[PDB]
Design a protein around this ligand. Structure first.
Ligand SMILES: CCCCCCCC/C=C\CCCCCCCC(=O)O[C@@H](COC(=O)CCCCCCCCCCCCCCC)COP(=O)([O-])OCC[N+](C)(C)C
Ligand SMILES: CCCCCCCC/C=C\CCCCCCCC(=O)O[C@@H](COC(=O)CCCCCCCCCCCCCCC)COP(=O)([O-])OCC[N+](C)(C)C
Ligand SMILES: CCCCCCCC/C=C\CCCCCCCC(=O)O[C@@H](COC(=O)CCCCCCCCCCCCCCC)COP(=O)([O-])OCC[N+](C)(C)C
Ligand SMILES: CCCCCCCC/C=C\CCCCCCCC(=O)O[C@@H](COC(=O)CCCCCCCCCCCCCCC)COP(=O)([O-])OCC[N+](C)(C)C
Ligand SMILES: CCCCCCCC/C=C\CCCCCCCC(=O)O[C@@H](COC(=O)CCCCCCCCCCCCCCC)COP(=O)([O-])OCC[N+](C)(C)C
Ligand SMILES: CCCCCCCC/C=C\CCCCCCCC(=O)O[C@@H](COC(=O)CCCCCCCCCCCCCCC)COP(=O)([O-])OCC[N+](C)(C)C
Ligand SMILES: CCCCCCCC/C=C\CCCCCCCC(=O)O[C@@H](COC(=O)CCCCCCCCCCCCCCC)COP(=O)([O-])OCC[N+](C)(C)C
Ligand SMILES: CCCCCCCC/C=C\CCCCCCCC(=O)O[C@@H](COC(=O)CCCCCCCCCCCCCCC)COP(=O)([O-])OCC[N+](C)(C)C
Ligand SMILES: CCCCCCCC/C=C\CCCCCCCC(=O)O[C@@H](COC(=O)CCCCCCCCCCCCCCC)COP(=O)([O-])OCC[N+](C)(C)C
Ligand SMILES: CCOc1ccc(-c2nc3ccc(-c4nc5ccc(N6CCN(C)CC6)cc5[nH]4)cc3[nH]2)cc1
Ligand SMILES: CCOc1ccc(-c2nc3ccc(-c4nc5ccc(N6CCN(C)CC6)cc5[nH]4)cc3[nH]2)cc1
Ligand SMILES: Nc1ncnc2c1ncn2[C@@H]1O[C@H](COP(=O)(O)OP(=O)(O)OP(=O)(O)O)[C@@H](O)[C@H]1O
Ligand SMILES: Nc1ncnc2c1ncn2[C@@H]1O[C@H](COP(=O)(O)OP(=O)(O)OP(=O)(O)O)[C@@H](O)[C@H]1O
Ligand SMILES: [Mg+2]
Lengths: 577, 668
């Protein structure tokens, strides 16, 4: 099967466990043919005038021995095979999580979180089930079936077996057909139930409007209609579901009846014996299962093929967008310079960033601003290696970033995303992403630097509570301040503050900006924001309109010209406060 | 409890359940009598030769003819004379020997000559025996071919009848389950419609939707399981025991003893599988949450070089979940399947032991037909054990869902209403004296006092929490003030039906609540009473967008996007149009398009003016510029109406409204 071929790596990795499993499976399958035949032989020895306590003790002992055997060997092959399936589950989990940890934003833009979560929760299950249970069913449909068939043919009869087996193929075919036709209606009924769920959510969220226009009865009417539709679909499914038991019961009773009747017409002709008529019954009883195994196999193989095909598409088909190369030996960044950075944003026909000839010298606090949608955040996304380098050059003292290893560049940049992106961990732990080796005192120092000590004090000191799951006392300004605290803890050479503080008070923003520039003037800093107060003191301010820059002058030079006089506009806001 | 309410809901729709039980019983009886056909076909026909034979003349049909004489059995025999000339067809080894005279017991039989001696405890006699040819033996077997045929035909007829009745009893069980669940869903939704808004506020939408739908599916699965796995199996195990006892009383006690095995095994398997499945589910949920928060937040995980620590935690969870999976696998193997097979083999050993003990006692054997029936009944019995234990362990989740649903249904607090209004009030509303606290102590409204006369555009101004949306809630009786009084016209709000009160007044909240379906589905909320919405909507200044949006005519069906199919301005437009359609006397406007970082004011002010006329518009617009034309500006100083008057009057005093308006306008 294709899925088994594609899983060659896993089986080659684990060959001892799976060969032991298969050997024990075959041994148990062959051993299981003895009990019924020993019962038939006991019956025959009963009928013929020869049965002593010796023979009865022999039969009891052999039955117990075979029982204990099959028990232990069953335990061990089941353990090996299903533990191997669990191991495949673990391997796929590790592989998928590692690959995702490697990936970059463009991959997540191309693939929605829904598909990734489905692959990480459904396709892995399908592949593991393939590996274990599909193998079991292949061994049950290829070895148990033929073993039973030929054992009945040789040790019982070759006409009784042919006659008493015709209904089983028909039963298998009917079971497959009913499975397909019930799954179709099940999909329809699940679609109807999903519609019910959507309507209930819509009529329980916007309840204010529903109850303020006294429409809480037509809503009941609609819900009753859709519940009736769900019930009707559920009846249509039942109409085909109820055919599984009647069909198997009929086509197994026919098999038993043919075996018994045509063994009777053979015991009359002396081509069988009662013991052989009892063993045949038992053999058919144990053969009724490979018929289901065939269908389960043909289903799991294809489902696993699809799921593994998707898992490989997410894992291998996707290559890392940005990769490093021969790492130039640069110990720290110098004077970040952009020569002509014409970045063409992926999934965007327009350039979205033309050449930008701006240079930041060590410690030259820069600040950017402009109209919304001016592409003033693409600067840092270029500085962060997130997207492909595109066209241009960003040289850290003559060595393009595309040469510096990703780890070092990530170490230099203290990134503060504009969108609060905290995790559902303790506030203390949330602050320690920048530095995992913090000794719990520099944490307080950085908290003071961000002026978060006062606002953190009111929050209960329950291990600093937790943010992502449910903020005990959380606000946009607090999240911006904690992000700034993380970035400061990172102790970075280049500090990027994208929309540094658009939530905290103006006074608090000014104080934090003064503090950062006080203790990191010697180290570069990037400021993006709409409020020009934050970039008041910066010695290189670029205001970006559209996808280009307007003026490269200082704040005094920027205010001298009126090309973009938003500073004058907010000066009234400065007067407004 | 849970069983009490499940049984109460099951008594409803009892005709279907009783019919299903009876059809199941009939099909079960047919199936179980099948193997009795098998036993009789074995004993009376295949093993009939061993019975005694009596010599008789060629006078009676079925009297088999051997050599020159004809004998006939002791069953297919009329009684001319019993006499004492008896002949037997004995079996030794694989050989059938004809004895022309034998009056003695039966024991171990051996042949070295014609003696055919029977040993038993001690040798008794030797009888001149003759070997029977294959054809002669068949002649001794022929008379029973017709009985063979009749038993086979009976076995087939019962088979088809059992088929029909099984199909019927399964279909009726499923129809009963689906009707009960439909009733439960209808009742739960009605209760939701009769629930106070306070319950709605605290719980998120997801929880209540789950309670309505997912928990009732859990109930569906529970009813299917209890019906199609415990009642069916119980009736399938009672009939089997009946048949076994009819066959052999002594042996059936073995199965009566097996039952405790089932009980103990189910108990132990539940005890362990509950623990392992709980941990597996809890760790898998942790894995999924970690994966989601790593995809959602990958950027900073990479930026701060946290790829070597998040993976460590993920591997901890993965290893724990894998370990518990392995433990569950070990338990599952051991308890379920090797045990089923071990018990089956033990049953075979018990059959052999009992029948051998019988056969060693002077060769007095219990018919092999009993053995075949036992082997055919015990194979049937052991099939559903694994499913029974699985469901018994799995019932707990359904029990929890049932608890949640039945606690929702038993909530005493409710709103009893459902009476619309009679005549239009023309729009008189007042708040003479009220005070509202959401839960206790913390007051958001303190001695509020205003009388919004027929004059419209009475405005509330505030920010960051003062009790304006609280006033709106009080107006619609969403929350009761628990103190004071409120009047529309001369009546008191707390002295009339909720539906009547809300029939006078309209509402358009901040977010325009767009419902999936057509645009006409939104304007009328599928009222089906009001006929013309477009024509009326033609007077609401909505004549541009619908033409752009294909050819709606109320049949566009665009809202499938949940609202994203249009613009926010268009969404507010449709909300205003819906408010105008009902033509309410009062119109309580929350912050409508005046939410955050917005400049297109006229775009919705044009419709706001159209809806202003001939009502009593309560507007909570934050943009004081849009409200400058109001008549009864109200300022909320965190629960108090500190100042009252038009915009000019408030400007002169310069308390708080003048400062706020100056800031908002100058900043622009
Ligand atoms: C019956 C089904 C048994 C399990 C599935 C077998 C097929 C799995 C599979 O993909 O096989 C893989 C083989 O790998 C093996 O051969 C591994 C053997 C694992 C089973 C244990 C031995 C059983 C011995 C019984 C006791 C296929 O690997 P491949 O990479 O396609 O092989 C290279 C082929 N080439 C040489 C042409 C390039
Ligand atoms: C032919 C096929 C051959 C290949 C198949 C082999 C499978 C054998 C399955 C039996 C295994 C369990 C043992 C048992 O109780 O069975 C029987 C072992 O019977 C024999 O092994 C017979 C030969 C040895 C007899 C020695 C005297 C009994 C001691 C046996 C000690 C266990 C030794 C074997 C196990 C280590 C018990 O026999 P018994 O009826 O108690 O003995 C007769 C005495 N009596 C008349 C008083 C009753
Ligand atoms: C005349 C007599 C005839 C028979 C002769 C034969 C004599 C043979 C005698 C002995 C061999 C078998 C017993 C081995 C015990 C030690 C095993 C061990 O190392 O521990 C293992 C556990 O092991 C178990 O799970 C328990 C043992 C498994 C076998 C079945 C139960 C034994 C009782 C049967 C008796 C009742 C029979 C009922 C029917 C009558 C640990 O390693 P693992 O398993 O790899 O762990 C995997 C991890 N996981 C668990 C988390 C997945
Ligand atoms: C109906 C079809 C004819 C059956 C038939 O003649 O069976 C007869 C033999 O015939 C056989 O041996 C049939 C089996 C051969 C087909 C292949 C089976 C092996 C498959 C795998 C290939 C790799 C029945 O013979 P018997 O079952 O011994 O019982 C009657 C005895 N008598 C023949 C003396 C009368
Ligand atoms: C497409 C490939 C699907 C492979 C996985 C199986 C699957 O999705 O089941 C589908 C069965 O539909 C069929 O598989 C149709 C063909 C029927 C024969 C295959 C065995 C069906 C057993 C049974 C179900 O498809 P749906 O009901 O649309 O959901
Ligand atoms: C539905 C209800 C459930 C049961 C339905 C079924 C019921 C039928 C089961 C009982 C059959 C008994 C008759 C068999 C028999 O001995 O006939 C003859 C053998 O040849 C046959 O007739 C072989 C037929 C095999 C039975 C199965 C057929 C397929 C059913 C598939 C069903 C698919 C579904 C004997 O011939 P004769 O003339 O007596 O003598 C012969 C001697 N001579 C060879 C030397 C000449
Ligand atoms: C449920 C489906 C199950 C169906 C099971 C069918 C059982 C009969 C199988 C044949 C067995 C046999 O040897 O019969 C005959 C040969 O056979 C023939 O020559 C053909 C059958 C003729 C008799 C009609 C049998 C079916 C009637 C009923 C079914 C209706 C048809 C359903 C299709 C020989 O036996 P006989 O003819 O009885 O001779 C009697 C001899 N006596 C006088 C000593 C007593
Ligand atoms: C080759 C393999 C062997 C196959 C053998 C199969 C044996 C089983 C055969 C079974 C056939 C049984 C008769 C037909 C019943 C179904 C009729 C029907 O269309 O259902 C409709 C009426 O729903 C009912 O029929 C109600 C349930 C049956 C009545 C109560 C039982 C009476 C016996 C439901 O229609 P809908 O689409 O839900 O709307
Ligand atoms: C299927 C799942 C499980 C099987 C049930 C397990 C129960 C085990 C106890 C049964 C048991 O040993 O009792 C009896 C079972 O003997 C008979 O079956 C005959 C009843 C008479 C044996 O004891 P007894 O009847 O005293 O045996 C007489 C023999 N003696 C005279 C040599 C002593
Ligand atoms: C992790 C996600 O992926 C999965 C991976 C593996 C499994 C899985 N674990 C299993 C453990 C046991 C069995 C199983 N063991 C069986 C033993 C007997 C039978 N039969 C044979 C005939 N009798 C009468 C009834 C049926 C079916 C059986 N099915 C299947 C299993 N499938 C599930 C999900
Ligand atoms: C009038 C007398 O005629 C008769 C009528 C019916 C039966 C009969 N009784 C049965 C009880 C159980 C089974 C049965 N055997 C099975 C083997 C495997 C499976 N599985 C487990 C579940 N999954 C789907 C895999 C397959 C189910 C199984 N169900 C068949 C049966 N056939 C016997 C005689
Ligand atoms: N995910 C994206 N895919 C494609 N193009 C994008 C994406 N995000 C932004 N853009 C392009 O970038 C332009 C604005 O870029 P940028 O985010 O730098 O501007 P900004 O609005 O000033 O910044 P920010 O919103 O981060 O404060 C958008 O108009 C669009 O052209
Ligand atoms: N569900 C609630 N339970 C308890 N108190 C609540 C609840 N909702 C709001 N409050 C209380 O109400 C105040 C928040 O503002 P309020 O609801 O009074 O109106 P608002 O937010 O000013 O309205 P608007 O949206 O028009 O500005 C706080 O005192 C808060 O504790
Ligand atoms: Mg507000």
């Amino acid at each position: 099967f294709s899925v088994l071929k594609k899983l060659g790596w896993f089986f080659k990795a684990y060959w001892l466990r799976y060969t032991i499993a298969i050997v024990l499976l075959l041994a148990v399958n062959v051993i299981e043919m003895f009990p019924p035949k020993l019962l038939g032989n006991a019956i025959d020895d009963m009928k013929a005038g020869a049965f002593t306590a010796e023979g009865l003790l022999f039969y009891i002992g052999i039955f117990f021995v075979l029982t204990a055997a099959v028990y232990i060997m069953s335990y061990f092959w089941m353990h090996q095979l299903f533990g191997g399936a669990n191991l495949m589950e673990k391997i796929l989990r590790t592989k998928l999580m590692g690959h995702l940890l490697t990936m970059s934003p463009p991959f997540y833009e191309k693939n929605r979180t829904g598909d990734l979560m489905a692959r990480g929760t459904n396709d892995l299950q399908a592949v593991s089930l393939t590996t274990g249970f599909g193998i079991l069913t292949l061994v049950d449909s290829t070895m148990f079936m033929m073993t039973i068939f030929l054992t009945m043919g040789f040790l019982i009869s070759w006409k009784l077996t042919f006659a008493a087996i015709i209904p089983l193929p028909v039963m298998a075919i009917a079971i497959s057909l009913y499975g397909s036709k019930i799954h179709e209606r099940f999909t329809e009924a699940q679609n109807a139930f999903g519609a019910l769920n959507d309507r209930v959510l819509e009529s329980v969220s916007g309840v204010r409007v529903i109850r303020a226009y006294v429409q809480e009865t037509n809503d009941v009417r609609r819900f009753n209609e859709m519940t009736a539709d769900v019930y009707q679909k559920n009846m249509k499914v039942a109409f085909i579901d109820s055919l599984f038991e009647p069909t198997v019961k009929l086509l197994v009773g026919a098999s038993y009846l043919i075996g018994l009747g045509y063994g009777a017409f053979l015991v009359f002709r002396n081509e069988l014996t009662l013991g052989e008529l009892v063993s045949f019954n038992v053999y058919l009883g144990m053969m009724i299962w490979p018929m289901f195994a065939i269908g389960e196999l043909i289903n799991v193989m294809q489902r696993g093929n699809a799921s593994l095909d998707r898992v490989n598409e997410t894992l291998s088909y996707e290559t890392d967008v940005t990769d490093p190369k021969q790492p130039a030996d640069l110990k720290e960044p110098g004077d970040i310079v952009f020569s002509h950075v014409s970045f063409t944003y992926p999934s965007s026909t327009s350039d979205n960033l033309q050449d930008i000839s701006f240079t930041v010298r060590k410690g030259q606090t820069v600040g950017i601003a402009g109209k919304t949608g001016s592409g003033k955040t693409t600067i840092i996304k270029q500085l962060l290696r997130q997207y492909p380098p595109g066209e241009g050059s960003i040289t850290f003292s003559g060595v393009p970033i595309q040469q510096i290893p990703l780890d070092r560049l990530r170490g230099w940049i203290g990134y503060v995303p504009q969108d609060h992106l905290l995790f559902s961990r303790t506030v203390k732990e949330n602050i320690l992403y920048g530095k995992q080796d913090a000794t719990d005192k520099e944490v307080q120092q950085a908290i003071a630097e961000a002026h978060f000590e006062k606002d953190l004090h009111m929050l209960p000191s329950g291990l600093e509570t937790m943010v992502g799951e449910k903020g005990v006392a959380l606000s946009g300004g607090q999240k911006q301040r904690i992000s700034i605290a993380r970035a400061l803890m990172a102790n970075p050479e280049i500090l990027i503050l994208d929309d540094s503080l658009s939530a905290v008070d103006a006074k608090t923003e000014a104080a934090i900006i003064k503090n950062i520039r006080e203790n990191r003037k010697g180290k570069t800093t990037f400021i993006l924001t709409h409020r020009l107060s934050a970039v008041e003191h910066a010695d290189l301010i670029l205001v970006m309109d559209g996808g280009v820059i307007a003026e490269r002058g200082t704040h005094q030079e920027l205010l001298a010209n009126n090309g973009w006089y938003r500073e004058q506009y907010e000066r009234q806001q400065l007067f407004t406060a | 409890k849970i069983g009490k309410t499940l049984w109460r809901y099951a008594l409803l729709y009892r005709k279907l359940l009783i019919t299903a039980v009876l059809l199941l019983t009939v099909a079960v009886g047919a199936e179980l009598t099948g193997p009795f056909i098998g036993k009789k076909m074995i004993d009376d026909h295949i093993l009939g030769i061993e019975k005694t034979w009596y010599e008789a003349a060629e006078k009676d049909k079925n009297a088999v003819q051997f050599h020159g004489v004809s004998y006939v059995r002791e069953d297919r025999l009329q009684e001319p004379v019993s006499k004492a000339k008896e002949a037997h067809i004995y079996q030794v080894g694989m050989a059938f020997y004809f004895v022309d005279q034998a009056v003695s017991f039966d024991g171990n039989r051996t042949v070295s000559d014609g003696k055919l001696t029977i040993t038993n405890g001690d040798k008794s006699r030797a009888y001149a025996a003759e070997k029977l040819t294959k054809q002669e033996l068949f002649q001794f077997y022929q008379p029973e071919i017709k009985g063979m045929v009749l038993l086979i035909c009976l076995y087939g007829g019962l088979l088809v009848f059992s088929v029909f009745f099984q199909y019927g009893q399964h279909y009726l069980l499923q129809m009963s389950a689906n009707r009960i669940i439909q009733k439960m869903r209808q009742d739960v939704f009605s209760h939701i419609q009769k629930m106070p808004i306070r319950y709605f506020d605290n719980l998120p939408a997801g929880k209540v939707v789950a309670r309505i739908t997912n928990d009732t599916e859990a109930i569906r699965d529970l009813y299917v399981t209890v019906l199609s796995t415990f009642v069916t199996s119980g009736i399938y195990m009672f009939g089997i025991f009946t048949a076994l006892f009819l066959l052999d009383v002594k042996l059936a006690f073995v199965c009566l003893a097996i039952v405790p095995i089932i009980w103990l095994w189910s108990v132990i398997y539940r005890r362990y599988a509950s623990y392992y499945n709980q941990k597996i589910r809890s760790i898998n949920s942790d894995i999924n949450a970690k994966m989601n928060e790593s995809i959602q937040g990958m950027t900073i995980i990479q930026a701060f070089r946290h790829q070597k620590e998040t993976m460590r935690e993920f591997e901890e969870l993965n290893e724990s979940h894998f370990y518990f999976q392995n433990r569950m696998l070990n338990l599952n193997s051991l308890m379920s399947h090797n045990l089923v097979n071990v018990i089956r083999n033990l049953a075979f050993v018990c059959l052999i032991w009992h029948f051998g003990g019988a056969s060693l006692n002077a060769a007095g054997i219990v018919s092999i037909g009993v053995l075949y029936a036992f082997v055919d009944y015990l194979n049937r019995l052991f099939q559903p054990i694994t499913g029974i234990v699985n469901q018994f362990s799995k019932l707990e989740l359904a029990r929890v869902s049932a608890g949640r649903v039945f606690e929702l249904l038993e909530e005493k607090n409710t709103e009893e209403a459902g009476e619309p209004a009679k005549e239009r009030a023309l729009g008189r509303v007042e708040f003479r004296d009220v005070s509202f606290a959401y839960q206790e102590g913390e007051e958001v409204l303190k001695h509020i006092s205003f009388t919004a006369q027929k004059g419209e555009t009475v405005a509330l101004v505030g920010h960051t929490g003062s009790g304006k949306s609280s006033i709106l809630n009080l107006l619609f009786r969403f929350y009761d003030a628990q103190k004071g009084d409120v009047l529309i016209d001369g009546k008191s709000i707390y002295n009339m039906s909720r539906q009547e009160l809300r029939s006078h007044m309209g509402i358009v909240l901040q977010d325009p609540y767009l419902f999936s379906g057509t645009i006409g589905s939104n304007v009328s909320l599928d009222d089906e009473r009001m006929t013309e919405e477009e024509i009326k909507n033609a007077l609401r200044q909505v004549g541009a967008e619908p033409l752009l949006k294909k050819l709606p005519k109320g049949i566009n069906e665009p809202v499938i996007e949940k609202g994203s199919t249009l613009s926010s301005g268009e969404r507010q437009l449709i909300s205003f149009a819906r408010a105008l359609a009902f033509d309410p006397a009062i119109l309580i406007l929350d912050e409508a398009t005046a939410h955050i970082d917005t400049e297109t004011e006229a775009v919705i002010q044009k419709a706001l003016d159209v809806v202003k006329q001939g009502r009593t518009t309560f507007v909570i617009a934050h943009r004081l510029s849009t409200i400058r034309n109001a008549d009864q500006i109200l300022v909320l100083d965190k629960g108090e109406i500190v100042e009252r008057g038009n915009h000019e009057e408030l400007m002169a005093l310069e308390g708080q409204y003048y400062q706020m308006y100056e800031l908002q306008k100058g900043q622009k």
